[PDB]
From a paper:
Here, we report the atomic structures of an engineered diffocin, a contractile syringe-like molecular machine that kills the Gram-positive bacterium Clostridioides difficile. Captured in one pre-contraction and two post-contraction states, each structure fashions six proteins in the bacteria-targeting baseplate, two proteins in the energy-storing trunk, and a collar linking the sheath with the membrane-penetrating tube. Specific attachment of baseplate tail fibers to receptors on the surface of a target bacterial cell triggers conformational changes of the neighboring baseplate, which leads to reorientation of sheath proteins and contraction of the entire sheath assembly. Since the sheath and the tube are anchored together at the opposite end by the collar, collapsing the sheath pushes the tube through the baseplate, driving it to puncture the cell wall and underlying cytoplasmic membrane.
By applying the corresponding symmetry during single-particle reconstructions, we determined cryoEM structures of the collar, trunk, and baseplate regions of pre-contraction diffocin separately at resolutions of 2.7 Å, 2.2 Å, and 2.6 Å, respectively. The sheath protein (CD1363) has four conformations in the pre-contraction state, all sharing the same structural domains but differing in the tilt angles of the N- and C-terminal extensions. We define these conformations as conformers A, B, C, and D. As the trunk assembles from the baseplate to the collar, conformer A forms the first layer, followed by alternating contributions from conformers B and C, and finally, conformer D terminates the sheath by interacting with the collar. Each sheath subunit engages with its neighboring sheath subunits via the conserved handshake interface, progressively assembling into the complete sheath in the form of stacked hexameric rings with helical symmetry (rise = 79.5 Å and twist = 35°). Four β-strands from three neighboring sheath subunits jointly form the conserved handshake β-sheet. The central tube inside the sheath is formed by stacked hexameric rings of tube protein (CD1364), and the interactions between the tube and different sheath conformers are the same. The inner surface of the tube has a net neutral charge stratified between alternating positive and negative charges, similar to R-type pyocin and T6SS, but different from phages T4 and 80α. The shape of the diffocin in the pre-contraction state mirrors a syringe, and its typical length is about 146 nm.
Author numbering:
A (entry chain Y), B (entry chain Z), C (entry chain G), D (entry chain I), E (entry chain C): 3 to 142
F (entry chain F): 3 to 354
G (entry chain r): 296 to 354
H (entry chain r): 178 to 236
I (entry chain e): 3 to 59
Amino acid sequence: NMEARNVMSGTWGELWLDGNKVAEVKKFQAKMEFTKEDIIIAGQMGTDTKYMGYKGKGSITLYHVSSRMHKLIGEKIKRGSEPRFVAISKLNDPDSYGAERIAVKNIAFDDLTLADWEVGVKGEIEAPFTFTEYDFLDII
Amino acid sequence: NMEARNVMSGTWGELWLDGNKVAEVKKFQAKMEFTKEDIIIAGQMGTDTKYMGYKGKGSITLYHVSSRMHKLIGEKIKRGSEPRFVAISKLNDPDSYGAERIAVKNIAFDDLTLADWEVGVKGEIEAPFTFTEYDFLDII
Amino acid sequence: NMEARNVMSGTWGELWLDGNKVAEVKKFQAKMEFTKEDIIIAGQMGTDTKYMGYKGKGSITLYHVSSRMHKLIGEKIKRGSEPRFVAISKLNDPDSYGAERIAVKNIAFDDLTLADWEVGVKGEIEAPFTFTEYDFLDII
Amino acid sequence: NMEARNVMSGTWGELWLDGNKVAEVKKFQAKMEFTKEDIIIAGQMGTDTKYMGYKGKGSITLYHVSSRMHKLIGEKIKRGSEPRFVAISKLNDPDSYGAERIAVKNIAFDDLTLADWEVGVKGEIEAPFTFTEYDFLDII
Amino acid sequence: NMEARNVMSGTWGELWLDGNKVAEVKKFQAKMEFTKEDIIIAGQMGTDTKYMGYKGKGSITLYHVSSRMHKLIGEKIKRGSEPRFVAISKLNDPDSYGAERIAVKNIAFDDLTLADWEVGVKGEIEAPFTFTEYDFLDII
Amino acid sequence: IGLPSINISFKELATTVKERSARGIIAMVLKDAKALGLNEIHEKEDIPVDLSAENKEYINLALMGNVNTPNKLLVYVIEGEADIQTALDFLETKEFNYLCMPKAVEADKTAIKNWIIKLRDIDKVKVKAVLGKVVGNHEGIINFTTEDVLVGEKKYSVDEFTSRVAGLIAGTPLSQSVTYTKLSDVVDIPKMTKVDAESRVNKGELILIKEAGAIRIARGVNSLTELTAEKGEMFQKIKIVDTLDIIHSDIRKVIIDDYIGKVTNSYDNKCLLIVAIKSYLEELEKSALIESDSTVEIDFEAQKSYLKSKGVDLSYMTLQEIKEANTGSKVFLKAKIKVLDAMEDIDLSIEI
Amino acid sequence: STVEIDFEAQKSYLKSKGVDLSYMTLQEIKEANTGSKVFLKAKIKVLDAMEDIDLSIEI
Amino acid sequence: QSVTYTKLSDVVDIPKMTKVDAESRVNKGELILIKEAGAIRIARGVNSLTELTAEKGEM
Amino acid sequence: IGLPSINISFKELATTVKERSARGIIAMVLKDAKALGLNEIHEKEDIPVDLSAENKE
């Protein structure tokens, strides 16, 4: 029941940020990294672990076609007001079993690129972030 | 008695996780790393070691065809309940001497990938874990 | 008196472990790393050293044809009994001056690989170790 | 005769308190501090000492899994009736010469921890004590 | 005449206690602290001192392989009869000028460790003492 | 299964028993008309009641050790009117360290002496006998020559006290020697001057002397007296010969169990044998039975001689090729060790 | 180890049947028809086990 | 392997025989038992072939 | 082929002579009243007993 055609292709990804579609998206990533602490039990040779929580980390890459991130955060960051956002990522490959749609919430960006250009090179923007919550809509 | 045909090929590997077959498996690894501490003996130039225990470490890679990991751990991790699992790996190359089957127990995963996609790139998932026990069924 | 044909080729290596021939051996390494501590002498610009001892380190690589390491150490390590071994390495190139045979003693392995396989990749096992003694039989 | 494997590892320790086994024990200490008074002898440059007695001091550390110490001492200490306990400590490393088992008697604890928690930190309890008697069972 | 190789290494130390060699010795210390009293002389700005005596202090550290100290002193200390011991220390580094051997006499130990273990930690014992006499055998 | 039993009983103190030695096996040949065969004795109380009282006292004598009791006693009984060869042939199969027989005569001592010399020199089994009046020139014969030993107002002849001597020797740890070991149970021995004791020790006899305190053994010598270049003064001492016999027996066990008839006679297998023997010697060094820095290696001169005796031409033949050459079913090895003696003689010069 | 045609046995058989060996090539003799017989030869080596040991210990 | 020096545990007694006699019997072509510290054992794994020729060697 | 010979022997310490050279052949002619002829000598330990002490040295 496993066929090569079932593997999901990243070209069939879509992204909404702050309620707006991002047509120029190149990649999207979001992962929960667990905090685990070692615990040695008397009489047991194998060291065990206790789960303590998690830290959400992610990134977005865009082709540089507009000033999206500047408008989203630039003026507010300088004044000491930090905004938070919601992102929705959808992966719907027509040859796959179904679609994967996930909302990532309480997003805080790590930085802001004002300018990054080089002669003979096309422009791209990498924007890392952190987050704390999520919801599953249409898992496979 | 050693021939090139006897070397085991990784294409002949199979994996069960939580009692379910994983048809989309790409690699499987599990290793016990020993804790050793130096001990210098009076009158001896070569420093020796004392064995104190071990830490089990491993990883699984899958082609992205479904939401297997999401369903296994996502909702429970957010609530503070950490689940533990059993995995069975089998390596049965028809040109080898025999089969090697091992159960890896008390598995705790290290993270959870919610999304990782890029335009023009096929989807894959890497899931590291830790473990404390094992059993030999059909060694060679 | 030095000719290119005299250089020893690694294909002419042989290995015994725990008294048994290892036909599937790919490489063997063993080295003594000296512990040296700096000593500055009054009136001398060049910093000197004092020799304090050594640490023996090595490694073995095998093609994966059997469960050799599993049987050697798996059950004993879990119970808290650490076994120690003797290895004999021989290098006898027919075009070289002579043979070089060395016994490496009080060997303690650093880990144990339970499984490591990937689709489309042939299996290999890498096993590092430490040791404290040795003997020269047939040096050149 | 003396080899690094003979050194006793603390992971092979076990503890009984008031007749009940303590599976969550992290460490155990018990030591007799001697009381010595200086004495200067006429005609002698080196000052000598006279032995006068001893004070027994110790402590236990546990992972916080239950309310063991609360149930042992809390209500009685408030009413003014101080309880006294017996502890048995056993160290049985399979690679050592033998087992070391000791009973520590007339134990009086120094304090009681009602709560000690911090966000992001796993719970531990430290319980110092004093004692006056002991007995040797299974010395090496 | 002086070179870095002449510095004596502590790995070439050996110890006898109460006539019995202790192969598990980690370190040995013995030192005489002088008692000095200030004396101000009329007409002199620099304050001088008068030598009055000395107090011998020392320590031994061992790897925990047996119940040596328990058997040496435990029963006698409880009954009130304090024993006294003789220790001999030898330092013979093959690259030094010669051997340094010293007898330390009328040793009285400061305490007794009944148990000191922690999960994941190898066992060691520290035994401080006092003494009044010594003798030189093989000075350099 | 019965009712539960909580049996709490009272009694007075019981006499302590001396500790058992892991080493030292004694075989003793006795004569009685009853209860023949081989009897294995572990503790003093376990003695078959069929033997006469005299044999019971002999066994009790052999039971007392020096620092520990001997590990095991093997008792062979013969009725009489028969050769001692009948018991010697049976003992050729058993494993033991010392052999004694309290009742003997000159021809019987001759039989035991010849038998042990045969075992040691021809059958390659290291055993020893303690005999009353025998002038053997061998390190395998211990000549105990003391007349009329008196224990608890009794008369023991020289031949019948050797059970006590054999137990004494078997009960001694390997790091020590029997020189000046005192026998508390002995009360009286015939008058003896120091010059005579010197002469007897020089002639190779194990004797008792009266010294400061109780009765004690004089010196720990063998019966060996003739010294050559191969056999020096060290071979005259009991302690050294005991250590050498232990080494011989252990190495022979390893060789016979693991190698003889089991593996092909190739150079690789010879190297494996060398490693095994070296590890045994290292184990001995870790216990201080022998000194450090002992070696094992291929005996090159002997192999060259064997190859020459077979018609091989050692012309333009590399030393490596000679070392690795096939030698039929034979192996030539050599080794070096060192053993220390006990403290026995002290000079102290005092200036006043 | 080796295996090959036993040329001399084939020649003796051919002589016994009456064929001529003069003016016959060696290749001609080797490939000659021999009814139902096949003549072959080989060479092997076998080693002995360990049964005698001499160990000389110097003290 | 070879049966040389193989021990037979259940055997516990054998007629006595001197060393030169055992040597002569082995050189005659007989398989014999011998006595040793511990159990009894086979002496040497020899055949009954004694007349050796240029085609039949000692192997 | 005889019986198997497993012999472990103990003996006092011994020395070793110098290693030999395959270089050097000397022809020496000496007059003697006994044992005339050609004598090849490999070592000084093995000299035939016929020669005089003066010629032996």
